[PDB]
C-alpha cells in the first residue's frame, strides 16, 4: 500500500477508522493532542471505498489507550490487519473488523501511544506506534 | 508464581534462560549493562527442575535485541509463556520452548529493551519489558 508516518505528538484525542466485517480495516485518521490543542492528522484512505466509518472520541486527557490488539489475515490474497481493538483505562472500543487469523497485541504498563505510521492499500497492511512518557 | 522486577538499565549483555521442549520457559536471568559495567541480575528460578539451559551472549554494544516474540498457552491448567525467540541485528536466538498456543511479538523500530519484570512459578507465567532510547 501507500506508506504513511504521522510522527509523534503529545497524546491521542480521537481515532477515526473504517472496517468491513467481510474483509478488514480500511481507513485510518488520528486527531492528536499537540501541547493541549487538537491536531487533525492526515486521513490515510484505502485505495477502495465501501467501509463502515467509526469515530472513537476519547475523554482526553483523563482517558488514554492501555492496549491495542488485532488480528492479521489473508483477504483476497493480501495479508492485512483484519481487526483492531483499542482498550483504554475507561473502556474497550471494538473489535472492529474480522477477528480471524493471527492475533497480535501491544499492552502498555507505563507510557503513551503518541503517533502512528504504517501502510494502507486496499486494506491496512501494517502499522507501528510511537511511544512516549 | 513468584514476582520479579529487575528494573531498568543501560542495555543488555547476556540472557540466560532455561526451557523444556515439552512444556515452557523455566528459569530467567539477565546480565544487563549499567553505564558500561555488567550488572548481574538475580537468577529468577522455576520452582521445578528438568529444564535445558541456554546462554545468549550478545556482542554488546554493537548487537542488540530488535524483536522479542513467543507463544503463550496451557501447561498443567495454567497460562504460561511457552516459547521465546530473541532476534537481534546480528542473529536469531530460539525459538526456545514449545511453539504453540497464542503468538505474541514486540518488534522495535527505535529504542532498546533495558529491563525485564514478570512472574515465575513452575514456568514463566508472564513478563513485561522496560524500553528506552
Amino acid at each position: 500500500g501507500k506508506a504513511f508516518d504521522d510522527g509523534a505528538f503529545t497524546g491521542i484525542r480521537e481515532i477515526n477508522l473504517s472496517y468491513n466485517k467481510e474483509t478488514a480495516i480500511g481507513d485510518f485518521q488520528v486527531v492528536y493532542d499537540l501541547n493541549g490543542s487538537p491536531y487533525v492528522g492526515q486521513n490515510h484512505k484505502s485505495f477502495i471505498t465501501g467501509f463502515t466509518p467509526v469515530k472513537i472520541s476519547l475523554d482526553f486527557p483523563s482517558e488514554y489507550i492501555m492496549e491495542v490488539s488485532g488480528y492479521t489475515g489473508n483477504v483476497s490474497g493480501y495479508v492485512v490487519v483484519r481487526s483492531l481493538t483499542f482498550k483504554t483505562n475507561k473502556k474497550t472500543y471494538g473489535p472492529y473488523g474480522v477477528t480471524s487469523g493471527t492475533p497480535f497485541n501491544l499492552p502498555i504498563e507505563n507510557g503513551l501511544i503518541v503517533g502512528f505510521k504504517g501502510s494502507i492499500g486496499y486494506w491496512l497492511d501494517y502499522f507501528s506506534m510511537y511511544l512516549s512518557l | 508464581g513468584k514476582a520479579f522486577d529487575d528494573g531498568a538499565f543501560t542495555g543488555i549483555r547476556e540472557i540466560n534462560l532455561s526451557y523444556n521442549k515439552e512444556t515452557a520457559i523455566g528459569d530467567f536471568q539477565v546480565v544487563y549493562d549499567l553505564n558500561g559495567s555488567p550488572y548481574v541480575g538475580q537468577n529468577h528460578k522455576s520452582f521445578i527442575t528438568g529444564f535445558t539451559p541456554v546462554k545468549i551472549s550478545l556482542d554488546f554494544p554493537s548487537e542488540y535485541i530488535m524483536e522479542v516474540s513467543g507463544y503463550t498457552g496451557n501447561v498443567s491448567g495454567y497460562v504460561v509463556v511457552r516459547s521465546l525467540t530473541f532476534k537481534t541485528n546480528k542473529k536469531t536466538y530460539g525459538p526456545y520452548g514449545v511453539t504453540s498456543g497464542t503468538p505474541f511479538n514486540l518488534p522495535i523500530e527505535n529504542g532498546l529493551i533495558v529491563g525485564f519484570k514478570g512472574s515465575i512459578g513452575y514456568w514463566l507465567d508472564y513478563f513485561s519489558m522496560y524500553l528506552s532510547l
Binding site: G111, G118, S119, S128, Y130 | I108, E109, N110, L133
Partner: peptide, 15 residues
C-alpha cells in the same frame, strides 16, 4: 547526530 528529536517506536504489526 541530527537536530530531529526521536522517540521510541514499536512495531510493525500486520504483514
Amino acid at each position: 547526530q541530527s537536530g530531529i528529536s526521536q522517540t521510541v517506536i514499536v512495531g510493525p504489526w500486520g504483514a
